[PDB]
Amino acid sequence: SMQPEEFAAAARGGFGGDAEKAKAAEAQEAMRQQMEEQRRIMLRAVLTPAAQERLHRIQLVKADKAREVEALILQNAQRGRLADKVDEATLIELLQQTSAASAAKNTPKVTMRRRFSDDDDDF
Q: Pinpoint the residues of the chain covered by CATH 1.10.8.
A: 48-121
Fold of 48-121: Helicase, Ruva Protein; domain 3 (1.10.8)
- What is the rounded CA–CA span in Å between residue 96 and residue 51? 14
- What is the rounded CA–CA span in Å between residue 78 and residue 72? 10
Q: Which of 88, 30, 89 is nearest to 54 (CA)?
A: 89
- What is the rounded CA–CA span in Å between residue 121 and residue 112? 19
- What is the rounded CA–CA span in Å between residue 23 and residue 2? 32
- What is the rounded CA–CA span in Å between residue 75 and residue 96? 17
- Give CA separation, 65 vs 35, 69, 71, in Å: 21, 6, 10
Residue type, 38: Q
User: Where are the alpha helices (H) located in 1-123, listed in sequence order?
Assistant: 21-34, 38, 45-46, 51-61, 63-79, 88-97
Q: What is the number of alpha carbons within 13 Å of residue 4 lying toward its C-beta?
A: 1
- What is the rounded CA–CA span in Å between residue 75 and residue 81? 9
